[PDB]
Design a binder for this molecule. Structure first.
Ligand SMILES: CCOP(=O)(O)OC[C@H](O)CO
Ligand SMILES: CCOP(=O)(O)OC[C@H](O)CO
Ligand SMILES: CCOP(=O)(O)OC[C@H](O)CO
Ligand SMILES: CCOP(=O)(O)OC[C@H](O)CO
Ligand SMILES: CCOP(=O)(O)OC[C@H](O)CO
Ligand SMILES: CCOP(=O)(O)OC[C@H](O)CO
Ligand SMILES: CCOP(=O)(O)OC[C@H](O)CO
Ligand SMILES: CCOP(=O)(O)OC[C@H](O)CO
Ligand SMILES: CCOP(=O)(O)OC[C@H](O)CO
Ligand SMILES: CCOP(=O)(O)OC[C@H](O)CO
Ligand SMILES: CCOP(=O)(O)OC[C@H](O)CO
Ligand SMILES: CCOP(=O)(O)OC[C@H](O)CO
Ligand SMILES: CCOP(=O)(O)OC[C@H](O)CO
Ligand SMILES: CCOP(=O)(O)OC[C@H](O)CO
Ligand SMILES: CCOP(=O)(O)OC[C@H](O)CO
Ligand SMILES: CCOP(=O)(O)OC[C@H](O)CO
Ligand SMILES: CCOP(=O)(O)OC[C@H](O)CO
Ligand SMILES: CCOP(=O)(O)OC[C@H](O)CO
Ligand SMILES: CCOP(=O)(O)OC[C@H](O)CO
Ligand SMILES: CCOP(=O)(O)OC[C@H](O)CO
Lengths: 65, 65, 65, 65, 65, 65, 65, 65, 65, 65, 65, 65, 65, 65, 65, 65, 65, 65, 65, 65
């Protein structure tokens, strides 16, 4: 017979690019990277404003159904 | 006589490369490796974007029916 | 007289190398060793991709009918 | 008179080294010791690949008819 | 003759999607998930707010009468 | 003469694939696996969502009348 | 027949938004959050003053009778 | 029926603004933030003299019975 | 004829909501829940302060004479 | 007839608020929580000085004869 | 009838303020606080010389017979 | 009746000022205080030569039998 | 007539306070309490040095002839 | 009549202070406390050199024949 | 009668000062305290060369037959 | 009788001065102290070339059979 | 008359010190104590190399014919 | 009469020093001690290379026929 | 009679120097020591390239048949 | 008999020089050594470009079948 773990396209619409996961991961950096100027106060946490769209593209387009 | 544990080719189409297992294991890294910037915020969990296709190839092509 | 526990060659074709046992033991590692990155996320469970063919050879070739 | 419990050489050809007992005791370890990696996944049940031929030699060569 | 274990459509209306089981499995997570901030107080038990509708769809739509 | 234990085809229509047994074995997992997130709250009881259709196919298609 | 697990609207008025669950989950945070300034004394446990109303809205509005 | 988790207004008069919680959270800062002049002796632990009345207002006035 | 197992309404007034069974089941939790803070001392046995009135309503209103 | 499990008001005066149960459950916390400063020596077991009067009120005033 | 768990005033004279419990808890801090200056030797375990008389007053004067 | 936890005056003469506890806590400071001039070699551990008689007086004279 | 189960006052002088039962129950605690420091070695079995005289008073003075 | 459980003074001379019980309990601490420096090697099991004479006095002098 | 737990003076000559216990407790410190210079390499485990004769004198000379 | 823990003089010739323990404790210092010049490169680990013979003389010459 | 249960001195020569019971009880410890280093591998079962001759001396010399 | 449990000297030649027991206990340490360098990788299980000949000498030379 | 646990020289040829045990213990260090340069990247796990031939010689040449 | 742990030359061709282990250990350094110029940016991790071929030669040529 065939497989039974899929056939619904439910997990693809939940954990994907056009879903809600991309919104909860973009606000976690500004929650701590924009308030750490108290103790440190140094130009350090600035290389993460471009790796968000790159990590989501090299992991979602691996299989693609 | 012959064997009775197979002869249906059901588990091969369920736990394989062209199935649904490769999709449930590709989104588990972005679920935790992309949200751990709140506590650590360091370049560490970045070597897992290439070992996914390697581990699935060295285990599925062992017997191959 | 002779023995009566064998004379059919049924268990040899069921629990052997050229059967279905080698397939149910190769997918059990990827089912749990490839999804435990949510809690651990460490290079640890990687020494099992070579002990599968070794353990099956040191046990099946002991008697050999 | 003599004894009447033997004189047939039936149990010696059934429960011995050159019989079918040595085949049913070698597949019981790989049936569960090779699939218990789902819960434990540790190096524990590995000292049993040498005690099979030792236990069968210290019990069969005791009397020897 | 036919079967006698069914023919009433009683267990389908009790253990299903349009019943009361989906309401008891949705409050059990927040009952111990929203109050465990005393000892733990971390971001770990957040991946269960999307697997509720996925597990119920890969189990109820298997047979479907 | 012939046999008298069959000839009615009653147990085949009751304990089979196209009967009511396949419906009572699919809801027993969600009754306890979906509510065990209180004490455990882990990813362990997630492999039973594919072995339901596999065990029923390696047991019913053994004889087949 | 119909189901017998509901028909009383008792668990809905006990575990919901307009009940007492929303009050016991808001005091547990300040009970350990406003007193942990003796050991750590940092800015880390400050993101929980907005996720209280978000987690209760992505869980109660799932089924809704 | 209704709910049984409240209807006494006991926890509201104990863990609130006009209770005793506001008195135990104001002396914990001076117990350690004012005696750290021995090893550190710097102007650092001075931002907690205004966040006490703010954190107690954004958490107590969320529901308000 | 009719039945002879009822017609007295004796067990209904003894094992019911407006009887004495609801009183012997409400003091059994405080007898063991308020004393288990010695060896364990953990917030765990707190989910039983609402399931008492629910379990007594989903079992008594099933038949109702 | 009526019920026979009550009619004496004996268990109400023994396991209640104005009895001796409230005196035994108040000394069990100080017997072990005030002496555990040997191994732990931390501010953790301090939230139980207010939940004693709350748990006894949400369980005794449920039925009330 | 009345209660039978009290009426002797035995536990009150044993576990109280004017008993021996206040003496076994006042010397427990000096047994471990005055000796931890070897490995640590830091101003840390100094907030316990005032919470002894406070914890014994907020628990004994709760009921008071 | 009276109490049974005391009536011997044994723990008072063992853990007190006129006992042997004051001698084991006065030599433990110089055991690591006079030899820490290797790695540190700074004026730091010098304020502990006056807090020995103060901490023993504010803890022993609390109850005083 | 009267009763014939008493009238001798024999069991009262054997199983009572002023008998030998109070002596066989006071040494059984130290028999296992003073020797359990081998494997455990913890302050745990110390709450039984006061409940001996309490349990014997709330059980013997119940009837009192 | 009188009691028959005593009248011999045998258990008093066996399980008492002037017997052999005080000798078997004084060497149990040095058997495990003086050898646990191999793995732990810390000042922890040192509060037992004074509780030996105290526990034997608060249990033997309770009744005293 | 007298006691029967002693009268042989066997445990006194085995677990004492002039026995073999004092020899097995002096080599355990040098077995690990003298080889821990690999990872630690710090003056720490040096206060144990004087507490050996002190602990054995406050334990063996307690009763002394 | 006499003791049974000794009477062989085996542990004295194994863990002593004229044995093999003095040879394993002398190479562990040069194995890590003479190679730490990579990161540190400072005169610090040089006070251990005289405490080897001192620690073995204050431990072996304590009892001496 | 006299007794008939003795007068043969048979059980005394079989279950005694100068018999064979003392040999079967001394090898049972090394059979399980020298092999438990596989799973546990800890210093725990070492207190039995001295209690063998003590238990046999407090049991055989009780009556002594 | 004499004893009947011995007189064959069979268990002495099987469970002794000059037998096969000393060989099965010397290879059990290297099977588990030389493989724990994977997860732990520390110097801890190195004290067993001298206690093998000591434990076999203090147990075999106890009686000696 | 003689012993029956040996007489085959099977365990000596399996667990010895000239067998397969020396090969499985020499590759376990490079499997985990040559890959730990990711998280640590320090010269620490380099003392095991000489203790392999030493530990195998001090355990195999103990008895030697 | 002979040994049964080898006789296949499988682990030698898998964990050796002319296999795949030498390739997975050479890319692990450039994965972390070429990217650590962010936080550190110093010439420190440059001693690993020569110890790769040395460590693989001092461990593989130890036995050599
Ligand atoms: C401008 C450098 O930014 P980063 O590379 O993030 O920091 C490196 C050092 O930690 C600077 O102190
Ligand atoms: C100590 C962790 O504090 P957070 O604010 O959780 O994270 C910020 C960076 O990790 C600084 O370390
Ligand atoms: C550079 C890639 O990440 P890692 O190898 O995990 O870095 C080591 C430390 O954890 C960094 O502090
Ligand atoms: C922020 C995500 O954390 P997880 O990887 O789910 O868990 C981490 C460990 O369990 C605790 O360090
Ligand atoms: C390095 C290969 O994996 P393992 O040997 O399982 O690592 C042990 C520790 O858990 C390291 O973190
Ligand atoms: C090859 C060793 O196997 P085991 O001794 O069974 O396992 C090691 C410990 O028990 C850790 O769990
Ligand atoms: C996340 C791993 O899940 P499983 O492998 O199913 O279980 C292994 C342990 O029991 C987890 O604690
Ligand atoms: C006051 C008790 O000790 P801690 O909470 O650890 O103190 C904070 C830091 O240790 C200051 O250095
Ligand atoms: C000086 C202001 O106080 P803080 O922001 O707490 O400290 C910042 C740096 O850590 C100074 O050292
Ligand atoms: C947090 C509420 O209590 P539980 O759900 O019983 O917690 C699970 C573990 O047993 C915690 O120890
Ligand atoms: C510090 C407050 O007490 P608790 O909430 O009991 O502890 C929380 C963490 O476990 C700190 O360790
Ligand atoms: C001056 C007394 O000693 P401390 O207060 O410990 O000094 C603080 C810093 O350690 C100075 O270096
Ligand atoms: C000092 C507390 O003693 P207990 O409550 O008897 O024990 C609690 C834990 O179980 C100790 O591990
Ligand atoms: C004499 C003190 O004994 P303990 O309190 O058992 O040890 C101190 C801490 O527990 C260190 O961990
Ligand atoms: C230096 C004295 O020895 P210890 O008191 O054992 O160590 C104290 C601190 O841990 C030093 O780091
Ligand atoms: C000067 C001798 O060595 P040490 O005393 O270990 O030095 C301590 C500081 O680290 C100096 O650098
Ligand atoms: C030398 C003490 O041995 P034991 O008392 O048997 O064990 C102590 C703990 O159980 C260690 O875990
Ligand atoms: C002397 C090497 O250390 P050990 O005392 O064997 O072990 C200490 C801990 O158990 C490991 O951190
Ligand atoms: C260069 C010494 O290495 P090790 O002795 O393995 O470790 C000791 C310290 O912990 C260095 O970090
Ligand atoms: C140029 C030396 O490099 P390393 O020896 O790796 O480091 C030593 C110091 O810590 C420099 O940072």
């Amino acid at each position: 017979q065939d497989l039974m773990a899929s056939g619904n396209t439910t997990v693809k619409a939940t954990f994907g690019k056009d879903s809600s996961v991309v919104k909860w991961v973009v606000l976690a950096e500004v929650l701590v990277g924009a308030v750490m100027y108290m103790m440190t106060k140094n130009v350090k946490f600035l290389a993460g404003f471009a790796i968000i769209s790159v990590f989501i593209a090299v992991g979602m387009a691996v299989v693609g159904l």
